[PDB]
Amino acid sequence: QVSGIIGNLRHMALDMGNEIDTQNRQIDRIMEKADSNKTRIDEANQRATKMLG
Amino acid sequence: GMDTSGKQAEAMALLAEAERKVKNSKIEEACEIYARAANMFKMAKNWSAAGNAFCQAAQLHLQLQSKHDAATCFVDAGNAFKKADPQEAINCLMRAIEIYTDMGRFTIAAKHHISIAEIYETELVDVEKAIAHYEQSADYYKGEESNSSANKCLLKVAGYAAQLEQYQKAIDIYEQVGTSAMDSPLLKYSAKDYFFKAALCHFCIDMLNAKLAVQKYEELFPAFSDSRECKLMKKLLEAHEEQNVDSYTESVKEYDSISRLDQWLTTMLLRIKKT
Amino acid sequence: GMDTSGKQAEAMALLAEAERKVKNSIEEACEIYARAANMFKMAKNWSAAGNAFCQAAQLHLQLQSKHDAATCFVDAGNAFKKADPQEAINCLMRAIEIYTDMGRFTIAAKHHISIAEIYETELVDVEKAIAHYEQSADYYKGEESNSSANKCLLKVAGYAAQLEQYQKAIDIYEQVGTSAMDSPLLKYSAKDYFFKAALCHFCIDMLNAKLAVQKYEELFPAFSDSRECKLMKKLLEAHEEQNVDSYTESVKEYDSISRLDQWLTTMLLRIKKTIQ
Amino acid sequence: GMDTSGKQAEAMALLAEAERKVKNSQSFFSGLFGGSSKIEEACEIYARAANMFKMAKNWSAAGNAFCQAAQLHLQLQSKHDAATCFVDAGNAFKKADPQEAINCLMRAIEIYTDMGRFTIAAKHHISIAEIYETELVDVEKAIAHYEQSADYYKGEESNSSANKCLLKVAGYAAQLEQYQKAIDIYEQVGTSAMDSPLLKYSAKDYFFKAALCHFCIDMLNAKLAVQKYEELFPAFSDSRECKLMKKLLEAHEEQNVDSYTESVKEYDSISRLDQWLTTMLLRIKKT
Amino acid sequence: TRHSEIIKLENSIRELHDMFMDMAMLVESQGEMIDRIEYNVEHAVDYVERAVSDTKKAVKYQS
Numbered sequence A: 001q002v003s004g005i006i007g008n009l010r011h012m013a014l015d016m017g018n019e020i021d022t023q024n025r026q027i028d029r030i031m032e033k034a035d036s037n038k039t040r041i042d043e044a045n046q047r048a049t050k051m052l053g
Numbered sequence B: 001g002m003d004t005s006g007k008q009a010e011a012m013a014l015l016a017e018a019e020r021k022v023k024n025s026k027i028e029e030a031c032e033i034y035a036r037a038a039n040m041f042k043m044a045k046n047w048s049a050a051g052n053a054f055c056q057a058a059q060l061h062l063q064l065q066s067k068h069d070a071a072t073c074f075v076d077a078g079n080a081f082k083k084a085d086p087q088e089a090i091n092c093l094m095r096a097i098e099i100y101t102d103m104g105r106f107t108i109a110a111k112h113h114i115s116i117a118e119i120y121e122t123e124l125v126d127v128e129k130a131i132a133h134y135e136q137s138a139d140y141y142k143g144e145e146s147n148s149s150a151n152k153c154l155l156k157v158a159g160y161a162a163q164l165e166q167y168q169k170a171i172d173i174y175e176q177v178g179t180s181a182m183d184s185p186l187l188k189y190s191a192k193d194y195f196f197k198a199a200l201c202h203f204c205i206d207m208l209n210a211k212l213a214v215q216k217y218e219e220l221f222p223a224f225s226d227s228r229e230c231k232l233m234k235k236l237l238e239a240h241e242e243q244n245v246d247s248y249t250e251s252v253k254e255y256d257s258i259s260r261l262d263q264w265l266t267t268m269l270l271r272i273k274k275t
Numbered sequence C: 001g002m003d004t005s006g007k008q009a010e011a012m013a014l015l016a017e018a019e020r021k022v023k024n025s026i027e028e029a030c031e032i033y034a035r036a037a038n039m040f041k042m043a044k045n046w047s048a049a050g051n052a053f054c055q056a057a058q059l060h061l062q063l064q065s066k067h068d069a070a071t072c073f074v075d076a077g078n079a080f081k082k083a084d085p086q087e088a089i090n091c092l093m094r095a096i097e098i099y100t101d102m103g104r105f106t107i108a109a110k111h112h113i114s115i116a117e118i119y120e121t122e123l124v125d126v127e128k129a130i131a132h133y134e135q136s137a138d139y140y141k142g143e144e145s146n147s148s149a150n151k152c153l154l155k156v157a158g159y160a161a162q163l164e165q166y167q168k169a170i171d172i173y174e175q176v177g178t179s180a181m182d183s184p185l186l187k188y189s190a191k192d193y194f195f196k197a198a199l200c201h202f203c204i205d206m207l208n209a210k211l212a213v214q215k216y217e218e219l220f221p222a223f224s225d226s227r228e229c230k231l232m233k234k235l236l237e238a239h240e241e242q243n244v245d246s247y248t249e250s251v252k253e254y255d256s257i258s259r260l261d262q263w264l265t266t267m268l269l270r271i272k273k274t275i276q
Numbered sequence D: 001g002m003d004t005s006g007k008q009a010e011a012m013a014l015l016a017e018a019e020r021k022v023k024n025s026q027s028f029f030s031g032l033f034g035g036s037s038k039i040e041e042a043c044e045i046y047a048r049a050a051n052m053f054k055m056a057k058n059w060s061a062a063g064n065a066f067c068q069a070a071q072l073h074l075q076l077q078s079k080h081d082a083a084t085c086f087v088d089a090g091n092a093f094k095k096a097d098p099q100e101a102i103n104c105l106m107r108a109i110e111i112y113t114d115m116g117r118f119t120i121a122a123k124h125h126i127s128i129a130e131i132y133e134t135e136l137v138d139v140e141k142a143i144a145h146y147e148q149s150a151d152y153y154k155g156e157e158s159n160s161s162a163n164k165c166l167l168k169v170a171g172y173a174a175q176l177e178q179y180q181k182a183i184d185i186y187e188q189v190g191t192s193a194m195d196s197p198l199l200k201y202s203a204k205d206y207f208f209k210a211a212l213c214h215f216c217i218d219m220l221n222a223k224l225a226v227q228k229y230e231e232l233f234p235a236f237s238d239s240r241e242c243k244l245m246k247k248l249l250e251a252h253e254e255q256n257v258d259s260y261t262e263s264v265k266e267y268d269s270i271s272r273l274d275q276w277l278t279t280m281l282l283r284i285k286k287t
Numbered sequence E: 001t002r003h004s005e006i007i008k009l010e011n012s013i014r015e016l017h018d019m020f021m022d023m024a025m026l027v028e029s030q031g032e033m034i035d036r037i038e039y040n041v042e043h044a045v046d047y048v049e050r051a052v053s054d055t056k057k058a059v060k061y062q063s
Helices: A002-052 B002-023 B026-043 B047-063 B068-081 B086-102 B106-123 B128-144 B147-163 B167-183 B188-205 B208-220 B222-226 B228-241 B246-258 B263-274 C002-024 C027-042 C049-061 C067-083 C085-102 C105-121 C127-142 C146-163 C167-182 C187-202 C206-219 C221-225 C227-241 C244-257 C263-273 D002-032 D037-056 D059-074 D079-096 D099-115 D118-135 D139-155 D162-175 D180-195 D203-215 D219-232 D234-238 D240-254 D257-270 D275-286 E002-062
Strands: none
Touching: A002 B068, A002 E002, B002 B026, B002 B047, B026 B047, B047 B068, B047 B086, B068 B086, B068 B106, B086 B106, B086 C027, B106 B128, B106 B147, B128 B147, B147 B167, B147 B188, B147 B263, B147 E002, B167 B188, B188 B208, B188 B228, B188 B263, B208 B222, B208 B228, B222 B228, B228 B246, B228 B263, B246 E002, C002 C027, C002 C049, C027 C049, C027 C067, C049 C067, C049 C085, C067 C085, C067 C105, C067 E002, C085 C105, C085 D037, C105 C127, C127 C146, C146 C167, C146 C187, C167 C187, C167 C206, C187 C206, C187 C221, C187 C227, C187 C263, C206 C221, C206 C227, C221 C227, C227 C244, C244 C263, D002 D037, D002 D059, D037 D059, D037 D079, D059 D079, D059 D099, D079 D099, D079 D118, D099 D118, D118 D139, D139 D162, D162 D180, D162 D203, D162 D275, D180 D203, D203 D219, D203 D234, D203 D240, D203 D275, D219 D234, D219 D240, D234 D240, D240 D257, D257 D275
């Protein structure tokens, strides 16, 4: 019985992987975008102060 | 095919129109049109011209008042040139790293350092240059207190050094990583494996000090006794003590039967067995 | 090297320019100070950058800044953590106070934990570390953070059992076991908490320990199923019959079957010291 | 402690100053028409006082300050910020007593659904359901709140949270002696789970729950349900649940109570039982 | 046949250990990145809220 079970268990492990790695990659991308976004708004603020002087 | 020729013709026409517009407030329009031309050339599957246009647009943006956009353009140009002249891409990525570090973006700087090290090692045969970039990335991570990336970089550089016969630095790095993992709540149980790596280096140096080294490692980490790494170390020592052929062959066969030994591990094992 | 000298000169020039600007006179001075601090950091000379960071933080906070000032103070404290632990602790405490006044208890608790761990590792101080852990536990309780609250409770109970009275640790273990009883996922660890309490109850008296372990077994049926119940029964019987051979055999078997981290061995030795 | 006493005194002084400022705000507006800056300053001071009370660990005072800030900002037409302040007040009350939290969350949900903030409305409905479950035992109200929260979540197309609410609702319903709804929900969840390989394993538990729910009716229909589950999911036979239900049916065929008890004990040893499982087994043994 | 099943189980255990280590390191990196982005987004939202409040105050005072 244990043998069979462990076999099944191995399959489950693979299943988790099918998602995990991919998710991490996606996160990295959005992180980069977020940083850029912040800069952009900061730049906008600076531009908003350009006319005020 | 026809599609590639049409894409090339469209890219050439767009570049000519951009040149006409720039030749005849205008700086922003020139930058935007140059970026659009670079994107079109990239979509046209022309690597050299697309990379050159992207580099020119990045330089124009540098002329423009902006920093993050310049760094993004630099990294995109480096990625594009990844399949082109490596030297220009490396220089552009180094400049982007400097720009990032200027405002304190040390995390992205370390990431780009690791990227340039990776490209240098995979593309060219000179891997020594990548070692400096990896060390700089590790130092940046240590300054930022990133344990995982620092440990990965230290392990990679130690492995490369061991492949280069620099046993002292590799063994020091392996011991430091092992003790850090032991202190840390996680990765401690795997630290035994790291210890073996360090031991391997010492095993290549001498045999009479091997007994003292293994005794010190055992007393430092008494739980290491049940580890199969201690079994491998003692079996290798016993095999090397007596000049026979069966001992080392059966030891390597038995240890391989569980898991496939790494190429560097097997190379060092063969080197020690031959002598 | 030449790079370090150049960065140091640039930082000094920027500091002088900022000093001149502030003497003449608003955010330009703070920007110059931050740029000088970053340039000094580039040099890898961790020393003397923290001073620029503190100057920038003070100048920026003097003009009513709340969020940016707190972030700059946190950065200065992190910079000092490697350069000068005392300055890092001061900056972290200032940032904690500012953020807590702003209502951000997560950052305050994290900085308290960092101060406690730096005191435990770099310096020599446990009572202050315990107080910081308690404060972080209260802050995370305000946020109903179950994981951090449980971690802090376990750490506090362990430290108290090691050095302080055991009533608080015993109550914490009982509460954790009761909470985990309903939760299926955490039930496996629940028994361990009860086990810990038993050890604490042994520091006072043997009959009290017997009563406590009986109560823990009755409260949580699973505690009886685990072999730890048999181990406690054997230990209590050996103590009652006053036979060191049985105690030694039991501890040796426990060590051989399960590795020890010097905690259970220490408690067992403390229990055996009074066996006489 | 002395520090706690000092913090309480400072909080009381700040509350008195806020009361004076809000009192004088009306006079200033009448005499000069200075605007609404006074109300915003009073709300900020109330928030600071609530933070100080949290320093002193006073739930009631912090909740009162948050309510005052919420109403003051609501008078400013800032419906979103007023709803946020009401939500903060409800959270503060949850520490001591959620009695005010019920109306606070109701108002917050109404405000959020008026503008279209469906996710926060669903989360607040979930909070209301949890409050009712922990304070009262009236399951039906919690079920209704869970269905409302699920509907709100599906309104925003934000899944991965309504499904858990529906599963918890089905688990509650199974204990309330209702067959049709619980069985329908369990079978729907199972058939949805079989398609997804990750959740396919969890379908066996729902099939076993449905089989147990239908077993109380009679043995004949229980056997039909078991056969239907086996045909739909033959792999369910591999799980211990199918073996357990088959053993129970076989024991009941001969009224072998000792065999049933032995099987139940063996299953408990294999995996610790749950309150719902024990209740269902005891009810089944009645017939 | 006992040795075959024993070695198969050992190989499965070793593969599971390796996958555990890899995905655990990846999850730790993911947690570090999620913490960093949480801090960044908190700072950005606070900064934009302050800026928009200041802009609203300035425009209301001017008009």
